[PDB]
């Protein structure tokens, strides 16, 4: 079915490998067909025609200029020390 | 006073002095394999001259001359001095023909008359019949009618051959 050596040389190769040998070389029986039926890619979450508007889906307009943190604290104000994040132990 | 033959906007001089531009000269460089021919090809390719380089031998001898010119400015041709049809194909679209063809020793196929006199006559006659404006054939400094031999018997055949070639051109 598949091109290989006779099983005496196969047993010699399996003894010299130290393990049972699976064929590295690919064959036509192990692979899929080259001609496949024509697929249909399904629609995503917003190809519905009724409910969606772009104003609720526009990620490019929901960004803002960066927030001055001292000015933000000054506007909104008129224990452990602050860390940049959760403590991770890489030791 | 001095008429301009081409009168085509693609054929006139354009651009600056670099290699990618065109200087309006379409030069055919005979004997470009040799010692003077490399420097002549480089000085032509510095100014953006479209060059037709005819070679008589192998392609590996003239593959080094693609460096001097840009893309489209170097065109190789195969010729022989016993065949005027290849020279007619070479100089049919040339304004300048440069003759650097020469040999310092006798060859079993080409004698001194066959390379300095008769081959120069074939090149010059084909270039005159093809409408080439200029021809810049070289010579030797001490060319004479009867150059007397100084040391060897049979010497100064080269100088006499270059002299007879230059008056016949």
């Amino acid at each position: 079915l598949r091109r290989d050596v006779s099983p005496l040389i196969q047993r010699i190769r399996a003894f010299l490998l130290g393990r049972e040998h699976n064929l590295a070389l690919r064959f036509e029986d192990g692979l899929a067909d080259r001609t496949q039926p024509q697929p249909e890619i399904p629609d995503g979450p917003s190809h519905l025609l009724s409910a969606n508007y772009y104003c609720q889906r526009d990620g490019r307009r929901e960004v803002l200029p960066p927030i001055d943190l001292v000015e933000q604290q000054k506007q909104l104000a008129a224990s452990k020390l602050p860390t940049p994040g959760k403590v991770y132990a890489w030791d | 006073p001095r008429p301009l033959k081409t009168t085509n906007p693609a054929a006139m001089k354009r651009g600056t002095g670099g290699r990618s531009s065109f200087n309006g000269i379409v030069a055919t460089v005979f004997g470009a394999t040799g010692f003077v021919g490399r420097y002549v090809c480089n000085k032509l390719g510095k100014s953006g001259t479209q060059m037709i380089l005819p070679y008589r031998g192998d392609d590996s001898d003239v593959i080094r001359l693609k460096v001097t010119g840009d893309l489209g400015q170097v065109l190789f041709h195969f010729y022989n001095l016993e065949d005027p049809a290849s020279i007619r194909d070479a100089v049919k679209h040339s304004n300048v023909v440069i003759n650097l063809v020469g040999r310092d020793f006798e060859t079993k196929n080409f004698k001194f008359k066959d390379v300095h006199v008769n081959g120069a006559e074939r090149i010059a006659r084909i270039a005159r019949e093809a409408g080439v404006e200029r021809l810049i054939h070289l010579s030797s400094l001490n060319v004479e009618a009867n150059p007397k031999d100084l040391y060897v018997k049979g010497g100064s055949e080269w100088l006499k051959s270059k002299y007879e070639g230059e008056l016949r051109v």
Partner: protein, 89 residues
């Protein structure tokens, strides 16, 4: 050789006095023998009944984008993408 003096479908040919025909002494000139104009006027016009018709290249998704041509004006109406001609009697 006749390919040097042959004219392409864009109306281009090099002159006999031009230096640019010296590039074709060692490599032949490529002129496409299938001009698009002759093969688009060889196709007969399509007779239609409706006032407007749609064109999509004849292949569906593999043609051009679908456009609608009006046929109330007398004459042959040419699709601007594929060059097919429609007519209404």
């Amino acid at each position: 050789r006749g390919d040097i003096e042959k004219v392409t479908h864009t109306g281009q040919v090099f002159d006999k006095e031009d230096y640019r025909n010296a590039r074709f002494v060692n490599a032949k000139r490529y002129v496409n023998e299938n001009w698009g104009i002759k093969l688009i006027e060889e196709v007969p016009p399509k007779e239609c009944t409706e006032r407007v018709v749609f064109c999509d290249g004849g292949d569906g998704p593999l043609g051009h984008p679908k456009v609608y041509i009006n046929l109330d004006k007398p004459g042959n109406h040419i699709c601007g993408y594929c060059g097919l001609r429609f007519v209404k009697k």
